[PDB]
Amino acid sequence: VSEIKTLVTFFGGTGDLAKRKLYPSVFNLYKKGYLQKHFAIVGTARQALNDDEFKQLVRDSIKDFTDDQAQAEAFIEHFSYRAHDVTDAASYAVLKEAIEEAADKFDIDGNRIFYMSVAPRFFGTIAKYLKSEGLLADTGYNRLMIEKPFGTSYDTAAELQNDLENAFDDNQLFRIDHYLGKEMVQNIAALRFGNPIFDAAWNKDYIKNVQVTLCEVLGVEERAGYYDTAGALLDMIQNHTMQIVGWLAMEKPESFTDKDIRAAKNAAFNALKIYDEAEVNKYFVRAQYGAGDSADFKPYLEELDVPADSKNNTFIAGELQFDLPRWEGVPFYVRSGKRLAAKQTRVDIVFKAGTFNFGSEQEAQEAVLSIIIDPKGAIELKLNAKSVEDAFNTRTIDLGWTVSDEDKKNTPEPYERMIHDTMNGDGSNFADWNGVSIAWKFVDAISAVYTADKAPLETYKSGSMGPEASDKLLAANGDAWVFKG
Amino acid sequence: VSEIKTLVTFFGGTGDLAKRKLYPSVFNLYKKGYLQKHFAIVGTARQALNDDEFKQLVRDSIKDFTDDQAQAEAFIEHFSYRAHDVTDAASYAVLKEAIEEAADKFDIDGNRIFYMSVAPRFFGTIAKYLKSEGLLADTGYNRLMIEKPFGTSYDTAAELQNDLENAFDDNQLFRIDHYLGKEMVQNIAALRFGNPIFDAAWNKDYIKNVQVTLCEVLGVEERAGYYDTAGALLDMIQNHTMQIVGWLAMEKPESFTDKDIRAAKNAAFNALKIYDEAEVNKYFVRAQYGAGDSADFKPYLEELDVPADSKNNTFIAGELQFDLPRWEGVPFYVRSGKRLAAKQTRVDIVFKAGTFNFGSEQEAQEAVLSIIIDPKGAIELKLNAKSVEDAFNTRTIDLGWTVSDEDKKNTPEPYERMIHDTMNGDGSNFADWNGVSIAWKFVDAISAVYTADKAPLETYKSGSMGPEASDKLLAANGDAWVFKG
Ligand SMILES: [Ca+2]
Ligand SMILES: [Ca+2]
C-alpha cells in the first residue's frame, strides 16, 4: 500500500491509554504496511526513562499483538523518549531535539502529529509552546489530536478552542471521540445515501421518531470520583450521543468530502433547540440507579467515592427537536445510563405507519430500521407482511444481518481508525468546533437546571432499562423505545 | 369460528385431483371448525358407486390427514354420490335429486358451489345444464369453480367465457390458479401497501426492473403427451406467471376490496403491450432442454411420448412492457422452464442504484427486494452498506427472513385457500376475465410466431438456468437475473 510518512509525538506517552490503545494501534498500521521506513514515534511524559526503558514499555504494550518478534523489534526501532515538563517553555528545546533527531534519522519531511494524552489543563499550554518553541514542521502538515474531554461546559470549551487557535487552525485540530471511530457508526451514511429507498425516506414524511441508545450493564465501579460531577449527561450524552445524532440528523451533503459532511451536520446542529427550565422538565429525564434484585447490585449512593447525598445522574433520557424542514415535528430520543439491562449502542429509526387500510383486524404498523453498533454489528429491518392466518391480516416480521466472523476480525478498532485518519488528513469521523459548541450549549441548559435542582431525579432498579419516566416521555408522543433489553 | 353453511357438488369426484387435494382440503375446513353441521358434499362422475363405496373413496382420500377416526366418520356423513353423464340433460334430474336431498338432510339454505374437476370440453355443457335443469339454488349464492385451463388461446377462452355467462355472472365464476393461492404470493400486497418506504418506491423512479421466476428441476416426465402442445409458454407463463405479474404491476387500489384490487390489476393488464413478429424475437426467448452432465438427464427429444422432431419449448424467458406512467420504461422479466438448476418460484425487485458519489472505488449498487414463494417462504433485502476496509468503500449486504416451522406448518395449502375463499365469496386471489383475456392475447402473439417457426429455438444443458439468450436478453438493458441457481 502507499507509505504513510509521518512523525507522531505522544504527550503522556507512559499513561495507561498509550499502553493499552495508542501504541498497539500504531503497531497495526505498521503490520498492515502503511508505516514502513519514513516514520517515527516520540514519546514524552513527566517521569524519566532512557531509550531502552521506553522501548521496553512499548514492547510490553504491543506484546499481545506481536506475531513475529523480529517485526516487533523492527517497529520498536522507530521509538524515542524524553522526560518533559509541559509547563516549562525551556524544556521544549529538548523535545524539539528528539523530534528533529527522529526526522533526520528516518528522513521524514515534516508531517507531524502531536497527540495530547494528558490531563485537559495542559491542552492550551502544550499548544502554545508547540508553536512558540518551534516544534511545528515548516514543511508538510501539523495536526493536533486532542484527547477527551474538550471542555466541561461551553465557556471552558470555547476558551480551549481560543487557546488552540493561537497555534493551529480548526482543520488541524482532531478531537478524539472513539464512538465516531466505530465501524457501524460509519455505516449510517452508506445505508442512507447509498440506498435511494432510505435516502428519499430520511425525513418527516416517512419517519415518526429516531432513537439513539447507549446502555451499559456496569455501574460506576471505580471512576466515581470524576463521574460524580460528570454523570451520564456529560460522560455519554454531550459527547458520544450528540455526535451520533449528528450523522443521523444531517442534511444531504453536496458531496462526500469532510467539508460538505460537516456543513450538512452543522445545518442540523444549528437548528437544534436549546431548552429553558420548563422545557428541560418536559423533554428530559435524569435518574440514579438503586439496588437491583441481587445485593451485589448496590445503589449508586453506596458506591466507593460517592457522596451519600449525591444527586448525580447515572441515566439520562430526553427528546431533541430540530427546526429544519426535513425534521419538522420528528422527535429524536436519546438515552444513556449505567446498570441497565444490556450493554448496547444502537440506532432505531421508527417509520410512520402506512394509511392504506386492508380491512384487517391488525392494520399496518410502524416499520423499523435498527442499526446495532455495539457489541456486535447488526442491522435489522422490521416490515409489515401477511400473517399466516386464514383471514387476511398483517403482522410485522424481522429481516436481519450481522457482521461475519471474517468481518468482525478485520474491523479496525476506533483508536487505529482515528490515528490513521489524522495521518491522512481526514476529518470525516471527527467532531468540529461548531458541533462541539452546540452540543455544549444544548447540555449546559440541562445542567443548569440540575445544579439548581429544579428538576426531579428519578430512581430505577439496576438491571432495568431506566425509570418509568423514560417510557412516559415517549408515550406522550405515542412512541415507545424499540429496544426493551 | 363462524359456521360456513354451503353445499358443494364435485364434478369428476372420483378423479385423482379430488382424491389428492379436493377432499383433504375440505376436511381441513371441517377440522378447523368452519364446516360444522349445515354443509354437504355431493360427488358425481361417470363410474357407478353406491354411497358406501364413495364414502370409502373419501375415507382413503383423507386417511393421511385423519387424527381421530370418529371425526373423520362425522365428516364422511356429509358425502353422497350419483353416477352421471354431463352431456345427458335428463340425467341432471338425478343430480338435482341428490343436491336437494342433501339440502334438506343438513338444512342448507342454498349457498351452492359447483366444482368442475373435469376435462375442459365439459365446462360449457355443465354450466348450461346447471341452469336449464334447475340445479341452481333459488336462495343464497351459486358459485362455479372452473378448473384449469380456461381456454387454450384467446378465442377458445372467450368462447368458454360466453358459454359460462349464459348461466352465471362473471363474479360467480372462480377460475382455479393454485399459484394465486400460495401464501407468499398474497404477501406481495402487504409488503408493498403496508410499508410506505416500499409503497412510495413501487414505480419507475426507484425500480430498475422486476423479475419473476418459476423454475423446476424436473423434466417433462410423463405429461409429454399434453405438454408437447402446451409447452412452458402455456403451461406456466400464460397462467401462473401472468397472474403473479398482475399483483406486482397493479396500480395502488382505492381500497382492499377484490373489486378495487381487480380494477387496479386491470389498469396494468390493459396497458400491457402485445408483440408482433419482430418484437417476439427481440423481447422473447424459447428453448428446449438437452442432456445434462449425467446420462439420466436425457434431452427433451428422447423423453417418452415426445416427437423426435418436436420444437416445443420447455423454457420461456421474455420481457414485458407496461404503458403506464408508473412503469414507463421498467422491464418486467419473466422466465419459466424445466430441467433448470433449482425448483423455485420467486420475485426479484431490482432498484435503481443511487447517484450519490462517496468517492469510493466501489460506488452504490442496485438494492434488491427478493420474495421467495417456493419451496419455503423467505424475504431478502440486499442493501448498500460500508465494507470492512480501511478506506471508505461500499458493498452490498443481505438482510433476510424465512417462515418459521410454526408458520410453515400452519400455512393453508392453495386448494384449501381457493375453496375456502369461494365459500366466503372472495375473489381477491382469483383471475378475472379481463386478466385472462389479456394474458391470452399476450401469449397468442408469441405462440403465433412459434407455430410459424419464425423465431429460434435455443438449447440448454439440463441443470443450468436456461439458454445464454436468456442472459443476453437482460444484458441489453444492463440487467442480469438476480437468482443464479
Ligand atoms: Ca410532544
Ligand atoms: Ca430494451
Side-chain angles (χ1 to χ4, degrees):
Chain A
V1 295
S2 299
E3 181 179 23
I4 292 184
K5 298 166 174 172
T6 189
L7 195 164
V8 193
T9 300
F10 288 94
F11 287 92
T14 62
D16 288 324
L17 178 68
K19 297 177 176 185
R20 284 186 167 228
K21 333 220 100 288
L22 310 190
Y23 299 141
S25 289
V26 179
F27 189 34
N28 266 303
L29 294 180
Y30 183 70
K31 290 166 61 169
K32 288 181 165 178
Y34 293 107
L35 266 35
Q36 305 165 22
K37 285 185 179 296
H38 307 276
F39 85 98
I41 309 295
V42 177
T44 179
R46 287 279 176 122
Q47 83 183 89
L49 292 177
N50 58 55
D51 265 41
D52 286 7
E53 293 176 288
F54 181 54
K55 291 179 176 181
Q56 180 53 55
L57 180 151
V58 179
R59 193 168 295 109
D60 282 350
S61 174
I62 69 177
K63 187 209 167 185
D64 300 319
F65 312 92
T66 303
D67 296 315
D68 171 30
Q69 272 299 319
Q71 175 189 55
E73 299 307 310
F75 176 62
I76 297 178
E77 145 90 325
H78 300 252
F79 287 69
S80 53
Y81 186 85
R82 292 292 188 277
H84 174 68
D85 185 11
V86 298
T87 46
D88 197 334
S91 186
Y92 277 82
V94 186
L95 195 54
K96 171 171 172 55
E97 167 84 311
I99 289 170
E100 301 186 309
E101 182 174 81
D104 295 332
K105 180 179 179 172
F106 295 109
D107 195 16
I108 311 170
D109 194 359
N111 294 353
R112 299 171 193 181
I113 295 177
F114 305 96
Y115 196 118
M116 308 195 285
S117 203
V118 296
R121 64 181 178 259
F122 301 130
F123 292 166
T125 309
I126 290 175
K128 166 184 165 183
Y129 293 131
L130 291 174
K131 190 188 174 189
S132 65
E133 308 313 303
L135 272 73
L136 301 170
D138 34 271
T139 43
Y141 63 77
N142 284 287
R143 295 172 184 144
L144 185 74
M145 294 187 69
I146 310 95
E147 188 55 66
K148 213 184 77 62
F150 199 91
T152 44
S153 64
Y154 173 73
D155 286 347
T156 54
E159 207 179 277
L160 210 199
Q161 181 65 20
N162 187 232
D163 293 356
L164 303 181
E165 287 185 312
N166 279 329
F168 298 85
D169 295 294
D170 198 44
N171 66 348
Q172 292 177 298
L173 304 178
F174 290 69
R175 308 178 186 69
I176 281 67
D177 189 307
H178 78 293
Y179 274 71
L180 232 38
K182 291 170 178 293
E183 190 76 40
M184 291 306 301
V185 174
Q186 291 169 72
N187 267 263
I188 298 180
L191 258 16
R192 179 181 174 187
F193 306 124
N195 303 291
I197 56 173
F198 285 134
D199 191 11
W202 221 266
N203 54 75
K204 61 162 192 288
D205 296 337
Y206 298 80
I207 298 173
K208 199 185 191 293
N209 73 71
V210 179
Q211 302 176 10
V212 187
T213 295
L214 282 70
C215 50
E216 304 166 275
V217 291
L218 286 176
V220 73
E221 302 257 85
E222 60 203 283
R223 315 104 198 298
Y226 192 68
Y227 193 79
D228 197 59
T229 40
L233 188 56
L234 279 68
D235 187 57
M236 297 287 267
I237 297 293
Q238 191 286 140
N239 44 10
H240 315 312
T241 301
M242 290 302 297
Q243 289 312 302
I244 292 178
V245 173
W247 271 119
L248 298 173
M250 65 182 291
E251 286 284 2
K252 180 166 179 183
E254 282 155 36
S255 81
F256 209 52
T257 61
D258 47 8
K259 181 186 171 67
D260 291 344
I261 294 177
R262 276 172 161 142
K265 283 177 163 184
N266 287 329
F269 280 124
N270 293 328
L272 180 64
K273 190 172 182 183
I274 309 306
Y275 299 148
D276 73 344
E277 192 192 292
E279 295 180 274
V280 172
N281 275 272
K282 193 186 171 195
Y283 304 106
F284 265 77
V285 176
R286 61 163 179 160
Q288 188 181 279
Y289 65 79
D293 288 301
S294 181
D296 81 300
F297 278 118
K298 42 173 59 174
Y300 181 71
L301 300 182
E302 291 185 14
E303 304 284 69
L304 251 47
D305 302 345
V306 171
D309 70 320
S310 186
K311 283 185 167 174
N312 185 216
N313 56 89
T314 59
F315 174 96
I316 284 295
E319 179 189 328
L320 281 57
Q321 303 176 48
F322 292 84
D323 189 74
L324 280 179
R326 89 155 64 226
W327 296 123
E328 200 180 355
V330 182
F332 281 66
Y333 301 113
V334 303
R335 63 173 169 176
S336 191
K338 288 182 174 286
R339 285 299 182 218
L340 293 182
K343 192 305 166 194
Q344 280 204 350
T345 303
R346 58 184 295 137
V347 172
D348 296 299
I349 309 296
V350 180
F351 296 98
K352 286 169 175 275
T355 45
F356 179 88
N357 284 347
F358 296 94
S360 38
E361 291 312 280
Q362 176 58 70
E363 291 295 348
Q365 301 176 265
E366 292 138 340
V368 179
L369 171 62
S370 303
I371 306 168
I372 294 70
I373 302 155
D374 296 308
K376 196 177 169 186
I379 301 173
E380 179 182 277
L381 183 55
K382 183 189 266 58
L383 293 165
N384 287 282
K386 184 195 182 298
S387 58
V388 171
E389 291 184 295
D390 290 330
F392 186 87
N393 201 35
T394 68
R395 69 166 174 172
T396 51
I397 54 163
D398 301 308
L399 284 276
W401 169 92
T402 306
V403 296
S404 63
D405 293 331
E406 199 256 46
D407 290 302
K408 172 179 65 80
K409 295 169 179 179
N410 264 30
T411 298
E413 288 290 85
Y415 277 94
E416 183 192 325
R417 193 67 258 119
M418 293 188 275
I419 290 176
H420 195 165
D421 285 345
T422 303
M423 300 176 167
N424 288 328
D426 213 298
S428 305
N429 306 304
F430 292 97
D432 78 332
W433 172 236
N434 192 108
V436 183
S437 57
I438 296 300
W440 273 121
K441 277 168 171 166
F442 180 73
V443 168
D444 280 345
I446 302 169
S447 289
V449 177
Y450 298 164
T451 314
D453 198 29
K454 284 268 233 154
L457 176 67
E458 311 296 354
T459 189
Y460 65 95
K461 280 179 169 176
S462 291
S464 76
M465 282 301 294
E468 285 167 51
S470 183
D471 293 311
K472 296 162 175 171
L473 173 68
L474 281 63
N477 293 324
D479 298 319
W481 291 108
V482 171
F483 187 63
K484 298 289 174 185
Chain B
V1 295
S2 299
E3 181 179 23
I4 292 184
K5 298 166 174 172
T6 189
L7 195 164
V8 193
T9 300
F10 288 94
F11 287 92
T14 62
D16 288 324
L17 178 68
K19 297 177 176 185
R20 284 186 167 228
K21 333 220 100 288
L22 310 190
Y23 299 141
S25 289
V26 179
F27 189 34
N28 266 303
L29 294 180
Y30 183 70
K31 290 166 61 169
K32 288 181 165 178
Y34 293 107
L35 266 35
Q36 305 165 22
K37 285 185 179 296
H38 307 276
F39 85 98
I41 309 295
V42 177
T44 179
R46 287 279 176 122
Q47 83 183 89
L49 292 177
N50 58 55
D51 265 41
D52 286 7
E53 293 176 288
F54 181 54
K55 291 179 176 181
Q56 180 53 55
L57 180 151
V58 179
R59 193 168 295 109
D60 282 350
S61 174
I62 69 177
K63 187 209 167 185
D64 300 319
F65 312 92
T66 303
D67 296 315
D68 171 30
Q69 272 299 319
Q71 175 189 55
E73 299 307 310
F75 176 62
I76 297 178
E77 145 90 325
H78 300 252
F79 287 69
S80 53
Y81 186 85
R82 292 292 188 277
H84 174 68
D85 185 11
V86 298
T87 46
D88 197 334
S91 186
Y92 277 82
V94 186
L95 195 54
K96 171 171 172 55
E97 167 84 311
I99 289 170
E100 301 186 309
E101 182 174 81
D104 295 332
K105 180 179 179 172
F106 295 109
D107 195 16
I108 311 170
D109 194 359
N111 294 353
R112 299 171 193 181
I113 295 177
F114 305 96
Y115 196 118
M116 308 195 285
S117 203
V118 296
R121 64 181 178 259
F122 301 130
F123 292 166
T125 309
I126 290 175
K128 166 184 165 183
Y129 293 131
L130 291 174
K131 190 188 174 189
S132 65
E133 308 313 303
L135 272 73
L136 301 170
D138 34 271
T139 43
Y141 63 77
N142 284 287
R143 295 172 184 144
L144 185 74
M145 294 187 69
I146 310 95
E147 188 55 66
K148 213 184 77 62
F150 199 91
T152 44
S153 64
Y154 173 73
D155 286 347
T156 54
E159 207 179 277
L160 210 199
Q161 181 65 20
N162 187 232
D163 293 356
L164 303 181
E165 287 185 312
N166 279 329
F168 298 85
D169 295 294
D170 198 44
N171 66 348
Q172 292 177 298
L173 304 178
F174 290 69
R175 308 178 186 69
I176 281 67
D177 189 307
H178 78 293
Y179 274 71
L180 232 38
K182 291 170 178 293
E183 190 76 40
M184 291 306 301
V185 174
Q186 291 169 72
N187 267 263
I188 298 180
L191 258 16
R192 179 181 174 187
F193 306 124
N195 303 291
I197 56 173
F198 285 134
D199 191 11
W202 221 266
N203 54 75
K204 61 162 192 288
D205 296 337
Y206 298 80
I207 298 173
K208 199 185 191 293
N209 73 71
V210 179
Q211 302 176 10
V212 187
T213 295
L214 282 70
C215 50
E216 304 166 275
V217 291
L218 286 176
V220 73
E221 302 257 85
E222 60 203 283
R223 315 104 198 298
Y226 192 68
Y227 193 79
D228 197 59
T229 40
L233 188 56
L234 279 68
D235 187 57
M236 297 287 267
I237 297 293
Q238 191 286 140
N239 44 10
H240 315 312
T241 301
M242 290 302 297
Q243 289 312 302
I244 292 178
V245 173
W247 271 119
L248 298 173
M250 65 182 291
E251 286 284 2
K252 180 166 179 183
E254 282 155 36
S255 81
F256 209 52
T257 61
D258 47 8
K259 181 186 171 67
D260 291 344
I261 294 177
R262 276 172 161 142
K265 283 177 163 184
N266 287 329
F269 280 124
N270 293 328
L272 180 64
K273 190 172 182 183
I274 309 306
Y275 299 148
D276 73 344
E277 192 192 292
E279 295 180 274
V280 172
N281 275 272
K282 193 186 171 195
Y283 304 106
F284 265 77
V285 176
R286 61 163 179 160
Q288 188 181 279
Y289 65 79
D293 288 301
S294 181
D296 81 300
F297 278 118
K298 42 173 59 174
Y300 181 71
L301 300 182
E302 291 185 14
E303 304 284 69
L304 251 47
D305 302 345
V306 171
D309 70 320
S310 186
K311 283 185 167 174
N312 185 216
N313 56 89
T314 59
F315 174 96
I316 284 295
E319 179 189 328
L320 281 57
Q321 303 176 48
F322 292 84
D323 189 74
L324 280 179
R326 89 155 64 226
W327 296 123
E328 200 180 355
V330 182
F332 281 66
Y333 301 113
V334 303
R335 63 173 169 176
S336 191
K338 288 182 174 286
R339 285 299 182 218
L340 293 182
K343 192 305 166 194
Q344 280 204 350
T345 303
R346 58 184 295 137
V347 172
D348 296 299
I349 309 296
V350 180
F351 296 98
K352 286 169 175 275
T355 45
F356 179 88
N357 284 347
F358 296 94
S360 38
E361 291 312 280
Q362 176 58 70
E363 291 295 348
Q365 301 176 265
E366 292 138 340
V368 179
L369 171 62
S370 303
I371 306 168
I372 294 70
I373 302 155
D374 296 308
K376 196 177 169 186
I379 301 173
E380 179 182 277
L381 183 55
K382 183 189 266 58
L383 293 165
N384 287 282
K386 184 195 182 298
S387 58
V388 171
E389 291 184 295
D390 290 330
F392 186 87
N393 201 35
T394 68
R395 69 166 174 172
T396 51
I397 54 163
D398 301 308
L399 284 276
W401 169 92
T402 306
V403 296
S404 63
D405 293 331
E406 199 256 46
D407 290 302
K408 172 179 65 80
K409 295 169 179 179
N410 264 30
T411 298
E413 288 290 85
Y415 277 94
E416 183 192 325
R417 193 67 258 119
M418 293 188 275
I419 290 176
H420 195 165
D421 285 345
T422 303
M423 300 176 167
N424 288 328
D426 213 298
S428 305
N429 306 304
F430 292 97
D432 78 332
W433 172 236
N434 192 108
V436 183
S437 57
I438 296 300
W440 273 121
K441 277 168 171 166
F442 180 73
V443 168
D444 280 345
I446 302 169
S447 289
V449 177
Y450 298 164
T451 314
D453 198 29
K454 284 268 233 154
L457 176 67
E458 311 296 354
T459 189
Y460 65 95
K461 280 179 169 176
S462 291
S464 76
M465 282 301 294
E468 285 167 51
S470 183
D471 293 311
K472 296 162 175 171
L473 173 68
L474 281 63
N477 293 324
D479 298 319
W481 291 108
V482 171
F483 187 63
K484 298 289 174 185

